[PDB]
Design a protein around this ligand. Structure first.
Ligand SMILES: C/C=C(/C)C(=O)O[C@H]1C(C)=C2[C@H]([C@@H]1OC(=O)CCCCCCC)[C@@](C)(OC(C)=O)C[C@H](OC(=O)CCC)[C@@]1(O)[C@H]2OC(=O)[C@@]1(C)O
Lengths: 994, 994
């Protein structure tokens, strides 16, 4: 291990003490191996099937049911008679649900893949190393390589480790450092050293990163680090370090069971304290074991009554559907629960190139020099039409087309653009459109010459595919390209050496075509070319050039400026060291300015207003781009992120300036800034770190492994469709269209989804509330239990289930994006709403009881035990308070239960209608606003009857009831709930809220 | 209410003023009801669950612990630090034991049924009465009947109240007055009056007792009394009046807590007076609150140290087991504690018929007249073999078989036996033995004819079941039985009127076959039959008959003599009033003697020696039988209750003679008598009354509600297995085999049980004694407490528990029944034994202290604070007497405690071996005499270690100790106890005792 892109090749072979010619001795291998370790990432997936199923039994709720399944299970074991076997239905049911539960929890973790699991898929299986114990090339296992030994790589190979390059045996070494960033554009490596000890991998031009591919050539070097010590390994560690918090819903939803559990235990203590008879009057007698079961018989019906089971199933059917929905919107949410956290989006950090813009580079402006004198200089502004890369378009001055060949400076300008370019074009067949081969920014430079056509080459004679590089091939003949000094973030410029085509052996006639950022390049020109003539360089002409760069850079028409110069009298060919990237800038000196060109990265059509929406939605958007702070701001002003004329001094920083500030001022700027330019590496994480210290649900974008740590810390990391897999597997969403708008699009749908959920979640635990009350009266008024766990179950699982599901389909409330984001703190049930369900609950919990106690007392036709004093007993052990009779077990009648049970069903089907909106009467909120609701309602009802007359079913649940004035009681005992509701529903006018 | 079996039917309707035809007017009902009351027994079971649990908190011991659970509970509330919550174990433990205690005390009273509760189960739910407000038969509630109104009863009915019969509408009225006595033999009722105003229910032949059943017919009468005024009600009152004293153990065991409590309060006062420092030296300072806890910290460990809790659990495991034991001996003890009072049995009162004897009646002798002359008369002695009822046997004179048909007198003798009998025979299938149908004494008379066979009827042609009544059916043809004058205790005889079978209408030829006790019958014969001839009756032949009755009655071969005569010329058929039982004797006059028969009630095989045992065991046995004093004594002489030739004049009384004596002479005779004949009704109680005035633990036997008051007053009332339920539920034991011996059998086992108990009870409070001493030194020598309540608990509950339990299994000491009964006064601990445990206690109470004080001072490896002067302080508030140091809390080390705790355990495991016998060295009393002891001992030890190394446990109790010369101290500090013991154990030789 040795982070050394700064140490020289010698200093490195030194540190490790090795021989580039022999290698590490079989001994040093053992020594180093045991010192450092196996070169591989800790493989971990210790999620055993056993432990797995168990993990699905830690949630208090599912636990409460368990203990509730025991009692039940044992209560069906303690009964006399031959029908004591028909008592095992209830328990088997419960446990079955507890099982089907675990099943599902285990069938997700099977396919539930993580990103860290992906990295391992980036490090190769085998590698070529040269050990001193031999001579040939032995290809050991990539897992067995160690820092220190010498390795070899060639085309197609996947770099096995962090490798400092010693010698590049091919003519040039090239690599696909894509997995790191995404820019497929291979890069050129070198052997010379890099001074800055703390330099970005991007500037480590003599290192080979593990996971990378040898695009071109073959070289050998010395392994500096391995395992989780390598660039990738570091990231994998950072990712394995991030603590991913639980969805706010999940949190809220969790505390609920925490409380529900508590309450339940309170009802139990209360109950006992209510009926403290035997503990104060009953003598020995014998009703001591019976008076026991009853107390336990009601606990199980105390759990299934409180536990809103079946809800999870609903929240899921809902999410899934919501998910498949967004899918059609080019938005792919991976984590089902995220569809919720999404809609709470406080802030959004999106990348410019490719999300905010289309990334369809295009040269539209370009000025050359016209003439210079005693401070009197003139330029030669231009314009070119052509959004696409196709040669479709024409150059024009003063909005009037001119012929390029008519201007000298434009022919040379066109030279460079062509000979200093490294990209090609091609006409697609299937698509029949012009496609780009190579760097965007280059292909455009190509397209420029393909238009200008400074040489009038017949193209109307060549097909669409043929003239793909017409005016280019022609200029490729005028000059024979010797070599090229690749662009470097260093001198931020690029060149290319080449000579004529009718030459022999003779010193003179060699050209160097430089292409770079105005600043540097221009700062290296000593001469200005005026067509064919060339004259020196002065303050006048210079500023007259720069300024315009600014016009074009910060002006309304946001453009990328690229300076073009040419070295007329370059150094003797046999005097250039084409291996010292450092020497390139010096070679590219004493230049001759030839022109400038402005490009454009068109802001996506849709982003235009999508930004606006976020302002309406109070969702902030911070743009992260590689553009200079200067043009960066301008681009923002152009997409609306900034006010065309507002001060943004303290609202836009550059990666550099950012680090300059102390963690105090650092965290501040994050709540205000909206534009980061030339953002450093570990910055999306720094930004997400802070945007979180202010409890803002953040959205981050970007791809590449060196971009996964941030997509994991954000509340909703976002990856492009075309992005890398690590990114995708490491993200909440995957913009298929890579189009920013798609984010806003989804964010909204999230808001809509959590709204309709928030309803059915209330509609559901509401029935539970009432249910409990019911089970609580029957416990105080010793009445036969009106409801049994079995029924209650079918209820919260089916009867209520459907309306719950339909209640998700509630039409999306408008004025959805005109409000700030939902605070994660915002509870589902509070204040008035609390008291409201508090009532709706008490009502049903009471109505249900008396809906059966009526079948006993005021009963029209039945055991009319009018004021029999059921509250007093169910003893009948005496049978004396009842003068004459030979039957008392009537108490356990199925008519009264089915009465209450039908009452519950009636109430809920209605209460499911009082849910289509929180505080709106049904007269403004017609039940037919949500047809799916009225629909399910019917399937819910015919189901109720389906379990009352269909011979089998009415056996296990309860007996049926006749239309014979039976149901009418039901209705006249239920419907009023709507009134209670509606009353309390729009009783909010008298409290100023809506 | 009106006790009137003496008033006539008129006089009765008079007293109450009612009309047998109309009845009581709806008014008189109210009037009488409010005068007398509801006809029912006061229902009482006011044992509320609340009060119940409370009743289980009045015992000083359990109370002391309570106050001891408070301090503890509050001491764990007054502590600083985060581990102040680990202090709630101790209290929770205590209270838990106090709770589990109450639990058990309540789970017994639930099923703990009483006899009085049974009586209520004898009075019917409804009854038929004729009120003057109607005509038909209205069946009101048996609870609503009142003295005065007319009732009706018929077959199957259960007599609702005390009813004087007015008219018997059926041909004859019969009743099952079983619940009163047990003799299932129904009785015949009448309407005529009974003169004697104070006559036994048995002679109240015109009354119907509540709880009784109408065996045959249907009659009506007038209710004379109800409620607790009826025969049954009286008894229920007597039973509810008896004060049942607490078992002698319970008494002794009670005074102990009474004293233990006292002592404890003395140790406290002493302690304070011991360390009176702060009250004489300490200035203000601040160790005033610490010096407080300590004083309270040792009180709780002063209670749990003294209170031998866990003992009750032992005395129970012991008793239960002892109980299930006797169970296999046909002895069923109902009250667990009785297994103790049993073994102290001073005297035993057993019933002859069925307990002392087998009650398998059998005629073995029978003499008829041979010839008479001038004072010259000869008889005709006989013999018949046949223990069982089966016809298996043959009549024989001079030991040589003769044919019955050859003697005239024997054919007639056989007539009566058959026609004057009212019982049948039958051959059982399952058992394949001859069973008896009817009165024992009759079936035998039947079996007699089934043998004699005076008519040579072929029976070897009929099955076993067929000839069941052969020679009988034959004689049942010779004479047609008209009617029968049922036996009455009055003329102590019975008859039967019948005529020939080839008759018309003609005065002459009617016979009356009389069957009774020699005395009366013979005294009514004017003629003697000599075969076919008949001659008068004279002094000679008469005495020649009587005498032999005496021979056979008092002679060695104890027999029941029954005289047989026949009235030749009875009164004209149409001249007998078959309704005036009084007129029967006169009808049965001018008789003709026909023969005599001797029976035998075989003394149970086992009783033979069982009586002897009691003499060895100094247990007196008094026989209560219905035999005449004459044959009674003889029977006693035969079973050994009496010396074959000793004077028993003042050692045997008849129910009559008994009452004749004044309460002065009455109570006397009870300590001397051993045989009561013709015992009156309220006499078993009178006898138990007296046998108790001499502090004799009495055993009484017998069954029937009219026999429960006595079974409740006796120290151990005894009921037969076949007895009535009131009796059983009203008794201490239930002889399943009804065989007297079973009593002696059990009585012995009781002695064995209280012996082994007496040991473990001593072994247990012994550890307590020592324990306290320990807790008393630590209090004087201010040493850190060597022992904590927590440990001490595990001790007296487990470590000591097991050996206690095994110590119950100590093999039964021989010479068990050769000693008089244990005096109830005899204390468990006194004299030398006191001083002995006084020492064994002081030793352990000291050894334990120094077993920890050693870990401090002389400590080999540890806080070797050699003579540190711990007695001086545990202050360290100064930390100056200890020059250099930064730690003092070492004091609260777990090593020293576990040291003492292990010391205790070692000592007790040994002291549990010094218990297998009071004054016997282990060299004569090997520890392997009681394997269960050596066994538990191991489980006791491995348990000790189990709470020292098993991670969890060693946490709450204390730390462990290494074999590394640690335990050796333990052993070398414990074992010597055995020496101390053994020394003091057999130091009794020098004091003449063993
Ligand atoms: C499932 C059924 C029941 C009855 C339950 O225990 O709900 C309580 C409870 C735990 C809360 C309450 C319920 O409180 C009561 O009903 C008070 C006791 C009365 C019952 C006695 C019988 C007469 C919720 C259910 O109901 C009402 C109507 O007030 C609403 C809400 O729940 C939510 O927002 C959770 C939604 C996911 C919570 O106040 C919640 O406490 C919280 O912390 C929240 C914020 O969770």
């Amino acid at each position: 291990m040795e982070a050394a892109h700064s140490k020289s090749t010698e200093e490195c072979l030194a540190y490790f003490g090795v021989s580039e010619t022999t290698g590490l001795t079989p001994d040093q291998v053992k020594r180093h191996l045991e010192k450092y370790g196996h070169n591989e990432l800790p493989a971990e997936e210790g999620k055993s099937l056993w432990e797995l199923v168990i993990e699905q039994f830690e949630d208090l709720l599912v636990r409460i049911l368990l203990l509730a399944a025991c009692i039940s299970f044992v209560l069906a074991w303690f009964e006399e008679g031959e029908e004591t076997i028909t008592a095992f239905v209830e328990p088997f049911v419960i446990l079955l649900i507890l099982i089907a539960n675990a099943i599902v929890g285990v069938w997700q973790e099977r396919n539930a893949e993580n990103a860290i699991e992906a990295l391992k898929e980036y490090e190769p299986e085998m590698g070529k190393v040269y050990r001193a114990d031999r001579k040939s090339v032995q290809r050991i296992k990539a897992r067995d390589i160690v820092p220190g030994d010498i390795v070899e790589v060639a085309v197609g190979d996947k770099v096995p480790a962090d490798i400092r390059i010693l010698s590049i045996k091919s003519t040039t070494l090239r690599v696909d450092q894509s997995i790191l960033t995404g820019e497929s554009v291979s890069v050129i490596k070198h052997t010379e050293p890099v001074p800055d000890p703390r330099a970005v991998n991007q500037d480590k031009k003599n290192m080979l990163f593990s996971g990378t591919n040898i695009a071109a050539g073959k070289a050998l070097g010395i392994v500096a680090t391995t395992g989780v010590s390598t660039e990738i390994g570091k990231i994998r560690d950072q990712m394995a370090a991030t603590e991913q918090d639980k969805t706010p819903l999940q949190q809220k939803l969790d505390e609920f069971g925490e409380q529900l559990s508590k309450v339940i235990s309170l009802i139990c203590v209360a109950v006992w304290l209510i009926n403290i008879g035997h503990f104060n009057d009953p003598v020995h007698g014998g009703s001591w074991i019976r008076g026991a079961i009853y107390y336990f018989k009601i606990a199980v019906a105390l759990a299934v009554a409180a536990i809103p089971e079946g809800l999870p199933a609903v929240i899921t059917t809902c999410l899934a559907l919501g998910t498949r929905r967004m899918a059609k919107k080019n938005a792919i949410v991976r984590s089902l629960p995220s569809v919720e956290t999404l809609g709470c989006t406080s802030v959004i950090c999106s990348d410019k190139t490719g999300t905010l813009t289309t990334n369809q580079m295009s040269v539209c402006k370009m000025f050359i020099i016209d003439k210079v004198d005693g401070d009197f200089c003139s330029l030669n502004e231009f314009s070119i039409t052509g959004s696409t890369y196709a040669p479709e378009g024409e150059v024009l001055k003063n909005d009037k087309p001119i012929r390029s060949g008519q201007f000298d400076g434009l022919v040379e300008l066109a030279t460079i653009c062509a000979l200093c370019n490294d990209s090609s074009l091609d006409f697609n067949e299937t698509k029949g459109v012009y496609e780009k081969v190579g760097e965007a920014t280059e292909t455009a430079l190509t397209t420029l010459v393909e238009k200008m056509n400074v040489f009038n080459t017949e193209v109307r004679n060549l097909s669409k595919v043929e003239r793909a590089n017409a005016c280019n091939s022609v200029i490729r003949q005028l000059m024979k390209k010797e070599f090229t000094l690749e662009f470097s973030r260093d001198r931020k410029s690029m060149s290319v050496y080449c000579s004529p085509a009718k030459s022999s052996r003779a010193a003179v006639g060699n050209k160097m075509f430089v292409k770079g950022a105005p600043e540097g390049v221009i700062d290296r020109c000593n001469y200005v070319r005026v067509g064919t003539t060339r004259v020196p360089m002065t303050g006048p002409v210079k500023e007259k050039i720069l300024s315009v760069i600014k016009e074009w850079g910060t002006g309304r028409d946001t453009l990328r400026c690229l300076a073009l110069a040419t070295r007329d009298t370059p150094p003797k060919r046999e005097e250039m060291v084409l291996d010292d990237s450092s020497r390139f800038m010096e070679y590219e000196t004493d230049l001759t300015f030839v022109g400038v060109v402005g490009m454009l990265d068109p802001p996506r059509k849709e982003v235009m207003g999508s930004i606006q929406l976020c302002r309406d939605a109070g969702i902030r958007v911070i743009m992260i781009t590689g553009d200079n702070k200067g043009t960066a701001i301008a681009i923002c002003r152009r997409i609306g992120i900034f006010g065309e004329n507002e001060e943004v001094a303290d609202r836009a920083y550059t990666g550099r300036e950012f680090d300059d500030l102390p963690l105090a001022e650092q965290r501040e700027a994050c709540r205000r800034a909206c534009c980061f330019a030339r953002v450093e590496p570990s910055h999306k994480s720094k930004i997400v770190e802070y945007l979180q210290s202010y409890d803002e649900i953040t959205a981050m974008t970007g791809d590449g492994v060196n971009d996964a740590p941030a997509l994991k810390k954000a509340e909703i990391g976002i990856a492009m469709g075309s992005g890398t897999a690590v990114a995708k597997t490491a993200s909440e969403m995957v913009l298929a269209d890579d189009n920013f708008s798609t984010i806003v699009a989804a964010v909204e749908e999230g808001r809509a989804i959590y709204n309709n959920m928030k309803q059915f979640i209330r509609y559901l635990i509401s029935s539970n509330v009432g249910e409990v009350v019911c089970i609580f009266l029957t416990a105080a008024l010793g009445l036969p239990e009106a409801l049994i766990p079995v029924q209650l179950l079918w209820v919260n699982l089916v009867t209520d289930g459907l309306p719950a599901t339909a209640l998700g389909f509630n039409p999306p409330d408008l004025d959805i994006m005109d409000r700030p984001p939902r605070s994660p703190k915002e509870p589902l049930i509070s204040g008035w709403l609390f008291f409201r369900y508090m009532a709706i609950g008490g009502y049903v919990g009471a109505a249900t009881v008396g809906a059966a106690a009526w079948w006993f007392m005021y009963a029209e036709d039945g055991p009319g035990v009018t004021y029999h004093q059921l509250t007093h007993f169910m003893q009948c052990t005496e049978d004396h308070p009842h003068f004459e009779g030979l039957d008392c077990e009537i108490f356990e009648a199925p008519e009264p239960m089915t009465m209450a049970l039908s009452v519950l069903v009636t109430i809920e089907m209605c209460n499911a209608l009082n849910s289509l909106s929180e505080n709106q009467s049904l007269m403004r909120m017609p039940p037919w606003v949500n047809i799916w609701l009225l629909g399910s309602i019917c399937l819910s009802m015919s189901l109720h009857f389906l379990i009352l007359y269909v011979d089998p079913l009415p056996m296990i649940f309860k007996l049926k009831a006749l239309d014979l004035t039976q149901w009418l009681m039901v209705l006249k005992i239920s419907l009023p709930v709507i009134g209670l509701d509606e009353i309390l529903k729009f009783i909010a006018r008298n409290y100023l809220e809506g």
